[PDB]
Enzyme design. Structure first.
Site, PDB file in Angstrom:
ATOM      1  N   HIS A 121       6.856   6.886   5.387  1.00  0.00           N
ATOM      2  CA  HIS A 121       6.301   6.429   4.123  1.00  0.00           C
ATOM      3  C   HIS A 121       5.678   7.656   3.496  1.00  0.00           C
ATOM      4  O   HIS A 121       5.605   8.727   4.123  1.00  0.00           O
ATOM      5  CB  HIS A 121       5.233   5.351   4.331  1.00  0.00           C
ATOM      6  CG  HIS A 121       4.126   5.777   5.239  1.00  0.00           C
ATOM      7  ND1 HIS A 121       4.144   5.608   6.604  1.00  0.00           N
ATOM      8  CD2 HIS A 121       2.974   6.432   4.966  1.00  0.00           C
ATOM      9  CE1 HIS A 121       3.038   6.160   7.104  1.00  0.00           C
ATOM     10  NE2 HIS A 121       2.295   6.675   6.144  1.00  0.00           N
ATOM     11  N   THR A 162      -4.150   7.005   8.815  1.00  0.00           N
ATOM     12  CA  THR A 162      -4.943   7.244   7.625  1.00  0.00           C
ATOM     13  C   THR A 162      -5.211   5.995   6.802  1.00  0.00           C
ATOM     14  O   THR A 162      -5.809   6.063   5.726  1.00  0.00           O
ATOM     15  CB  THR A 162      -4.297   8.300   6.744  1.00  0.00           C
ATOM     16  OG1 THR A 162      -2.969   7.888   6.408  1.00  0.00           O
ATOM     17  CG2 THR A 162      -4.217   9.639   7.479  1.00  0.00           C
ATOM     18  N   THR A 163      -4.687   4.868   7.263  1.00  0.00           N
ATOM     19  CA  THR A 163      -4.902   3.598   6.592  1.00  0.00           C
ATOM     20  C   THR A 163      -5.370   2.706   7.717  1.00  0.00           C
ATOM     21  O   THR A 163      -5.091   2.980   8.894  1.00  0.00           O
ATOM     22  CB  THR A 163      -3.595   3.001   6.000  1.00  0.00           C
ATOM     23  OG1 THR A 163      -2.680   2.683   7.050  1.00  0.00           O
ATOM     24  CG2 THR A 163      -2.921   3.978   5.070  1.00  0.00           C
ATOM     25  N   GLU A 166      -2.685  13.625   1.778  1.00  0.00           N
ATOM     26  CA  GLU A 166      -3.843  13.169   2.508  1.00  0.00           C
ATOM     27  C   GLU A 166      -4.463  14.392   3.137  1.00  0.00           C
ATOM     28  O   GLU A 166      -5.675  14.611   3.046  1.00  0.00           O
ATOM     29  CB  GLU A 166      -3.407  12.156   3.547  1.00  0.00           C
ATOM     30  CG  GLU A 166      -2.804  10.941   2.887  1.00  0.00           C
ATOM     31  CD  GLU A 166      -3.011   9.723   3.703  1.00  0.00           C
ATOM     32  OE1 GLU A 166      -2.493   9.680   4.832  1.00  0.00           O
ATOM     33  OE2 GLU A 166      -3.723   8.826   3.233  1.00  0.00           O
ATOM     34  N   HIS A 214       4.983  10.934   5.777  1.00  0.00           N
ATOM     35  CA  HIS A 214       4.549  10.718   7.140  1.00  0.00           C
ATOM     36  C   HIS A 214       5.692  10.076   7.880  1.00  0.00           C
ATOM     37  O   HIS A 214       6.146   8.978   7.507  1.00  0.00           O
ATOM     38  CB  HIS A 214       3.328   9.800   7.187  1.00  0.00           C
ATOM     39  CG  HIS A 214       2.069  10.440   6.678  1.00  0.00           C
ATOM     40  ND1 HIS A 214       0.987   9.691   6.300  1.00  0.00           N
ATOM     41  CD2 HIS A 214       1.772  11.754   6.530  1.00  0.00           C
ATOM     42  CE1 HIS A 214       0.064  10.559   5.932  1.00  0.00           C
ATOM     43  NE2 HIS A 214       0.495  11.809   6.057  1.00  0.00           N
ATOM     44  N   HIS A 268       2.479   9.059   0.588  1.00  0.00           N
ATOM     45  CA  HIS A 268       1.199   8.819  -0.056  1.00  0.00           C
ATOM     46  C   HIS A 268       1.399   9.737  -1.238  1.00  0.00           C
ATOM     47  O   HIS A 268       1.972  10.826  -1.085  1.00  0.00           O
ATOM     48  CB  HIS A 268       0.036   9.307   0.804  1.00  0.00           C
ATOM     49  CG  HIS A 268      -0.079   8.570   2.093  1.00  0.00           C
ATOM     50  ND1 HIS A 268      -0.804   7.410   2.258  1.00  0.00           N
ATOM     51  CD2 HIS A 268       0.515   8.804   3.286  1.00  0.00           C
ATOM     52  CE1 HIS A 268      -0.628   6.989   3.513  1.00  0.00           C
ATOM     53  NE2 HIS A 268       0.166   7.809   4.172  1.00  0.00           N
ATOM     54  N   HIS A 276       0.804  -1.219   0.000  1.00  0.00           N
ATOM     55  CA  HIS A 276       0.000   0.000   0.000  1.00  0.00           C
ATOM     56  C   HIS A 276       0.842   1.277   0.000  1.00  0.00           C
ATOM     57  O   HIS A 276       0.331   2.372  -0.226  1.00  0.00           O
ATOM     58  CB  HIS A 276      -1.071  -0.003   1.092  1.00  0.00           C
ATOM     59  CG  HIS A 276      -0.548  -0.224   2.474  1.00  0.00           C
ATOM     60  ND1 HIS A 276      -0.260   0.816   3.330  1.00  0.00           N
ATOM     61  CD2 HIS A 276      -0.318  -1.360   3.171  1.00  0.00           C
ATOM     62  CE1 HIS A 276       0.126   0.332   4.496  1.00  0.00           C
ATOM     63  NE2 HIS A 276       0.098  -0.988   4.426  1.00  0.00           N
TER      64      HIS A 276
HETATM   65  C1  SBB Z   1       0.459  -3.159  14.436  1.00  0.00           C
HETATM   66  C2  SBB Z   1       0.195  -2.922  12.937  1.00  0.00           C
HETATM   67  C3  SBB Z   1       1.094  -1.804  12.336  1.00  0.00           C
HETATM   68  C4  SBB Z   1       0.483  -1.212  11.023  1.00  0.00           C
HETATM   69  N1  SBB Z   1       0.337   0.234  10.656  1.00  0.00           N
HETATM   70  C5  SBB Z   1       1.210   1.356  10.788  1.00  0.00           C
HETATM   71  O1  SBB Z   1       2.328   1.246  11.286  1.00  0.00           O
HETATM   72  C6  SBB Z   1       0.802   2.758  10.286  1.00  0.00           C
HETATM   73  C7  SBB Z   1       1.597   3.864  10.522  1.00  0.00           C
HETATM   74  C8  SBB Z   1       1.236   5.125  10.058  1.00  0.00           C
HETATM   75  C9  SBB Z   1       0.061   5.377   9.329  1.00  0.00           C
HETATM   76  S1  SBB Z   1      -0.380   7.066   8.718  1.00  0.00           S
HETATM   77  N2  SBB Z   1      -0.827   6.951   7.116  1.00  0.00           N
HETATM   78  O2  SBB Z   1      -1.583   7.402   9.452  1.00  0.00           O
HETATM   79  O3  SBB Z   1       0.785   7.961   8.810  1.00  0.00           O
HETATM   80  C10 SBB Z   1      -0.768   4.260   9.079  1.00  0.00           C
HETATM   81  C11 SBB Z   1      -0.383   2.987   9.557  1.00  0.00           C
HETATM   82  C12 SBB Z   1       2.561  -2.294  12.230  1.00  0.00           C
HETATM   83  C13 SBB Z   1       2.991  -3.203  11.212  1.00  0.00           C
HETATM   84  C14 SBB Z   1       4.330  -3.667  11.097  1.00  0.00           C
HETATM   85  C15 SBB Z   1       5.262  -3.200  12.042  1.00  0.00           C
HETATM   86  N3  SBB Z   1       6.613  -3.435  12.224  1.00  0.00           N
HETATM   87  C16 SBB Z   1       7.083  -2.724  13.316  1.00  0.00           C
HETATM   88  C17 SBB Z   1       6.064  -2.022  13.855  1.00  0.00           C
HETATM   89  C18 SBB Z   1       4.871  -2.304  13.054  1.00  0.00           C
HETATM   90  C19 SBB Z   1       3.542  -1.850  13.159  1.00  0.00           C
HETATM   91 ZN    ZN Z   2       0.721   7.783   5.946  1.00  0.00          ZN
END
Ligand code: SBB
Ligand code: ZN
Ligand code: HG
EC number: 4.2.1.1
Length: 258
Positions: free
Chosen positions: A92, A196-197, A104, A117, A94, A62
């Site tokens: 990351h 945001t995801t 976003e 972000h 977007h 994504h």
């Molecule tokens: C626990 C699940 C998690 C998944 N998601 C995220 O980290 C995340 C981060 C920022 C944003 S945004 N667009 O709002 O800026 C959206 C999602 C996740 C997945 C893999 C990982 N490896 C190490 C830590 C870790 C956390």
């Molecule tokens: Zn993001």
């Protein structure tokens, strides 16, 4: 099926598996600069990324994440609207299929080409998993990217994108200095929001910098060559991986500048 950004699994469908999509503090939001309250009690932001240790770049299906070693206070965000120290875990972007969209958050309904972000989690919570269960667990520094001159600091990232073209692929990506992605000024708007995801958790204190950084057309172009699909599946270009602005509801966007 699994969430994405397409017609059949996109943001408008998220609420089905993630009811929080229609929550009270969802992100991103439109930053109406005229309704934003200048707040002189807000401290300046303190970004300490000198000891930053990037580990790898990963195409997660994504977006592509540049992960950092967040086991110690190597790269932290303090000050501003934050209480405590937030550790950089990953960053990351977007981006859009076109330069006129991709961000976003929007400023006065204006969409930027992309949005960086820099994801931080509150160290008082011990680990990233715990912080995502708290109102102030995350602090995402959002930086708008506008198309213009090349951002030298983003080039290392752009170069490695060939190696992680598809979902699941990762590449060693050490010694990357995230300070190369910061604009000149650290003025910001801040408001409480969410990821945001999906899971769209409402644990984020959003710190959106006023000043965008400019990257070149060739640079954002390489983002667009990434694939949502994994190796061997039909090719689906990774573009428009952004969630549209959500209702501000009972929130006030504060500003650190007049
Ligand atoms: C626990 C699940 C998690 C998944 N998601 C995220 O980290 C995340 C981060 C920022 C944003 S945004 N667009 O709002 O800026 C959206 C999602 C996740 C997945 C893999 C990982 N490896 C190490 C830590 C870790 C956390
Ligand atoms: Zn993001
Ligand atoms: Hg939360």
């Amino acid at each position: 099926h699994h969430w994405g950004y397409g017609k059949h699994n996109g943001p408008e469908h998220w609420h089905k598996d993630f009811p929080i999509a229609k929550g009270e503090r969802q992100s991103p939001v439109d930053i109406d600069t005229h309704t934003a309250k200048y707040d002189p009690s807000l401290k300046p932001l303190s970004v300490s990324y000198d000891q930053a240790t990037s580990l790898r770049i990963l195409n997660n299906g994504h977006a592509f994440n540049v992960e950092f070693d967040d086991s110690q206070d190597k790269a932290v965000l303090k000050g501003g609207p934050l209480d405590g120290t937030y550790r950089l875990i990953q960053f990351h972007f977007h981006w859009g299929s076109l330069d006129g969209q991709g961000s976003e958050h929007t400023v006065d309904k204006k969409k930027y080409a992309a949005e960086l972000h820099l994801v931080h989690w509150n160290t008082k919570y011990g680990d990233f998993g715990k912080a995502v269960q708290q109102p102030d667990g995350l602090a995402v520094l959002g930086i708008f990217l506008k198309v213009g001159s090349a951002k030298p600091g983003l080039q290392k990232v752009v170069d490695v994108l060939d190696s992680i073209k598809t979902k699941g692929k990762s590449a060693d990506f050490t010694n990357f200095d995230p300070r190369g992605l910061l604009p000149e000024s650290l003025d910001y708007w801040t408001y409480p929001g969410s990821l945001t995801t999906p899971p769209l958790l409402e644990c984020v204190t959003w710190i959106v910098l006023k000043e965008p950084i400019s990257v070149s057309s060739e640079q954002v172009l390489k983002f667009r060559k990434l694939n949502f699909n994994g190796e061997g599946e039909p090719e689906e270009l990774m573009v428009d991986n952004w969630r549209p602005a959500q209702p501000l509801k009972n929130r006030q966007i504060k500003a650190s500048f007049k």
